[PDB]
Design a protein around this motif. Structure first.
Motif, short mmCIF file in Angstrom:
data_model
loop_
_atom_site.label_atom_id
_atom_site.label_comp_id
_atom_site.label_asym_id
_atom_site.label_seq_id
_atom_site.Cartn_x
_atom_site.Cartn_y
_atom_site.Cartn_z
N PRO A 257 52.67 2.07 31.21
CA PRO A 257 52.78 0.91 30.53
C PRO A 257 54.26 0.49 30.88
CG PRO A 257 52.49 2.29 28.59
CD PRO A 257 52.37 3.13 29.82
N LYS B 122 59.38 0.47 37.26
CA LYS B 122 60.51 1.35 36.95
C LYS B 122 60.57 2.51 38.01
CE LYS B 122 59.84 0.76 31.96
NZ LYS B 122 59.64 1.26 30.40
N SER C 131 64.28 1.17 32.01
CA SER C 131 64.14 1.02 30.61
C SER C 131 63.10 2.00 30.13
CB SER C 131 64.25 -0.46 30.23
OG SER C 131 63.05 -0.82 31.11
N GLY C 132 63.21 1.94 28.71
CA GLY C 132 62.06 2.73 28.17
C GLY C 132 62.05 4.10 28.06
N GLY C 133 61.06 4.99 27.80
CA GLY C 133 61.28 6.29 27.76
C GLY C 133 61.47 7.04 29.11
N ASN D 198 53.73 -2.39 27.27
CA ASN D 198 54.00 -1.17 26.43
C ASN D 198 54.36 -1.42 24.85
OD1 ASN D 198 56.91 -2.34 26.42
ND2 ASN D 198 57.36 -1.21 28.41
N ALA D 199 54.09 -2.68 24.64
CA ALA D 199 54.36 -3.40 23.23
C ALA D 199 53.93 -2.55 22.05
CB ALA D 199 53.89 -4.77 23.12
N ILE E 43 52.77 1.15 22.34
CA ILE E 43 52.61 2.27 22.68
C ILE E 43 53.02 3.17 21.66
CG2 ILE E 43 52.72 1.97 25.11
CD1 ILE E 43 55.26 3.22 25.25
N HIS E 44 52.15 4.16 20.98
CA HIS E 44 52.73 5.24 19.92
C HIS E 44 52.64 4.54 18.57
CE1 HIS E 44 54.80 8.38 22.74
NE2 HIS E 44 53.82 7.67 23.37
N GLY F 197 56.31 3.89 15.93
CA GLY F 197 56.34 3.51 17.27
C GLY F 197 56.97 4.51 18.30
N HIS F 198 57.41 4.01 19.52
CA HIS F 198 58.01 4.98 20.39
C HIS F 198 59.41 4.94 20.22
CE1 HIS F 198 58.69 6.76 24.28
NE2 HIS F 198 57.54 6.92 24.49
N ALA G 257 61.87 5.59 22.22
CA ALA G 257 62.40 5.02 23.48
C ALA G 257 62.53 3.50 23.36
CB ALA G 257 61.96 5.52 24.86
N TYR G 258 61.61 2.98 22.36
CA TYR G 258 61.40 1.59 22.22
C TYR G 258 61.59 1.32 20.63
CZ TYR G 258 59.05 1.50 26.84
OH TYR G 258 58.75 1.86 28.04
N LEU H 80 60.99 -1.95 18.98
CA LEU H 80 59.47 -2.78 18.77
C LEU H 80 59.09 -1.86 17.43
CD1 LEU H 80 58.41 -2.54 22.39
CD2 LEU H 80 59.14 -4.32 21.05
#
Ligand code: ZN
Ligand code: ZN
Ligand code: ZN
Ligand code: ZN
Lengths: 375, 377
Positions: free
Chosen positions: A162, A173, A320-322, A343-344, A346-347, B193-194, B196-197, B200
């Motif tokens: 995402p 990406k 950006s991101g992971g 990705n708002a 995720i996890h 959350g993540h 890496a983010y 958020l």
């Protein structure tokens, strides 16, 4: 929505890393009917799927993972995370955004492409793993080792992570920051809470150190990667007794780092800060991923037009991101582009994806196949 | 040929009595005190076992207080010998409870047996107030026995608690009071959350670090000439299930205050909330006042202990309120003089807990002479 029906079928399978729980079989049974050669690749406790249609290049590969992160407090969810359901145009469930809905869109996109273009050029492939969220030592990295040993090259690889921020396809990406894991074990001495001078409390000694690490500025990134970021994921000490000092503190942290630093420079500044606080400890470092950046080529060009044609949005490149399994695919020379849903969430607990983006994403993926293998 | 105190110490130490399981320890004690005229009155509250053994119906009333429970072992990989397999190595008795406090329970019983043999016509009464929950929540232990004695007007004149009160040598320290004990379970709420983010999500470990750092180096008070300064300690800290790329939704922090009479529990709770609110933390705290500070008068019990200890070891004991607390906090409000006297406290709540065997007979002789100085002469 064929994408919604296949998504629900995958989302109902509890696949916490590294359990696949029939997800790669559901996908394989679908691809096996549209001329894809099914090649399961089990490495240790991880299941992987290499599916391929065609024997000549160029080779286009859809990459992704069936595993999801743990659900967390089950009483914090508004619905069973493995019992997917739709509430006010939103599909709720663990893996609904990362990334079972993309796995489904990639499969539907492929079936629809093979139907309209059965004599397409090159080859289409699927590289799926059940461990992308965890150690990732028996997932995509071992599949790639097998392909590299038999000279089977991938030209373009679209990872269905995402990648989107505000609207579908607003971000794609072509690279990612590195990932350096660590497990810090601060040593103390188990004793009585009211006799602290006869013991060593590791939580106390470490507090000023963890506090300094959290405010430490590692680097300011560069024009290709965001700044390095430090995050503590876990911290444990004690057995539950209110009047007993714990003998050991376990702190698990991670670094998502840019090319401004190396895993060895971060390792060195961290030991320096810990020794500065006069701590006695052991650290088990683990380089989960190197920073990587693939060249901007036709894959990016095919995605800019597919995204613009379906949503009317002008996509923007970012690292950006992971990270993703793109870090294990990039070293083969394949161009890597990550395109997915928002990705708002995720996890997070109550992870969800806007249903209105499932068909368009499928349309975008199908148009990328047309722009690279039709002509 | 093991002494009587060591013999009974081994029998009690062989019982895995983790709070609140008594595991027959109060029956071993009662079966022996019952042979020397002690009426046996067991009092079970919830899952906690308690014993009120009393010899005599008139005052003054001397009471031996103690607990049969021990703190958990954790794992046998860190212990040089099984913690519930009492063993002797270079004159040191190893095993859970060897110091806190089964060796004192044994000494108290042997002392009582020898005292009744020499002084059968002693004056007043001798009693044992034993609980199987002194180390844990302690809501169904000595506090319930005292509630029962108080409702029927049964008063204790003197109470010697066999907690390990010594620092460097037997009886160098005796305690007539203790600081309070205030427990808390702080739950800092973040947002899973993540990693890496992070923007958020909300990492509770990151938000609490600066707050926890300030609490650890905070000066609550300077104590006074009767109590040491208030000390803060974090016992347990937990967040996450193991995922390296997941920001945990909440941080659980368990802490304790051993506080002096310079502050109140409400004053400590008010400062903690100010410090946490200062760091803008979203959280909830479950407070548990385990014990109030207490200080009993210096009377005959202290005088008898000073004499006995001096006569047995040549040591001039010193009063104190240091260390943790004890069931003396539940007995002191009845008006009884409280004095804690026992073995060294250097290894309590530690791995490879042990007690010097050379202190077992002298401790017994001390307890026996305290009975003589208060109920014979
Ligand atoms: Zn993913
Ligand atoms: Zn993920
Ligand atoms: Zn004790
Ligand atoms: Zn204890």
């Amino acid at each position: 929505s064929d994408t919604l029906s296949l998504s629900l079928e995958l989302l109902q399978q509890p696949s916490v890393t590294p359990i696949d729980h029939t997800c790669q079989t559901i996908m394989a049974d679908r691809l096996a009917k549209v001329g894809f050669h099914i090649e399961p690749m089990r490495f240790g406790d991880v299941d992987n799927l290499w599916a391929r249609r065609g024997t000549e290049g160029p080779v286009f590969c859809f990459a992704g993972h069936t595993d999801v992160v743990p659900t967390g407090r089950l009483d914090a969810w508004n619905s069973d995370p493995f019992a997917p359901e739709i509430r006010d145009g939103k599909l709720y469930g663990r893996g609904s955004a990362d990334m079972k809905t993309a796995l489904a869109a990639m499969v539907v996109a492929s079936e629809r492409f093979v139907a309209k273009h059965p004599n397409h050029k090159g080859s289409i492939a699927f590289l799926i793993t059940s461990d992308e969220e965890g150690p990732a030592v028996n997932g995509t990295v071992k599949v790639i080792e097998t392909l590299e040993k038999r000279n089977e090259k991938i030209t373009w690889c679209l990872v269905g992570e995402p990648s989107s921020t505000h609207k579908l396809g607003d971000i794609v990406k072509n690279g990612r920051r590195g990932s350096l894991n660590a497990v810090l074990k601060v040593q103390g001495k188990q004793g009585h809470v009211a006799y602290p001078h006869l013991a060593r409390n590791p939580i106390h000694e470490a507090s000023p150190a963890l506090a300094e690490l959290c405010q430490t500025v590692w680097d300011n990134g560069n024009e290709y990667f965001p700044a390095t970021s430090f995050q503590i994921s876990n911290i444990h000490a004690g057995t539950g007794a209110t009047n007993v000092i714990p003998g050991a503190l376990e702190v698990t942290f991670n670094f998502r780092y840019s090319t401004e630093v190396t895993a060895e420079q971060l390792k060195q500044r961290v030991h320096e800060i810990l020794d500065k606080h006069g701590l006695q400890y052991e650290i088990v470092w683990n380089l989960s991923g190197l920073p990587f950046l693939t060249p901007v080529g036709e894959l990016v060009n095919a995605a800019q037009t597919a995204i613009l044609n379906v949503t009317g949005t002008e996509t923007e490149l970012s690292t950006s991101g992971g990270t993703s399994d793109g870090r294990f695919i990039a070293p083969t020379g394949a161009q890597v582009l990550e395109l997915g849903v928002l990705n708002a969430t995720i996890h997070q607990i109550n992870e969800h994806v806007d249903v209105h983006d499932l068909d368009p994403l499928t349309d975008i993926y199908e148009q990328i196949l047309e722009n690279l293998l039709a002509q």
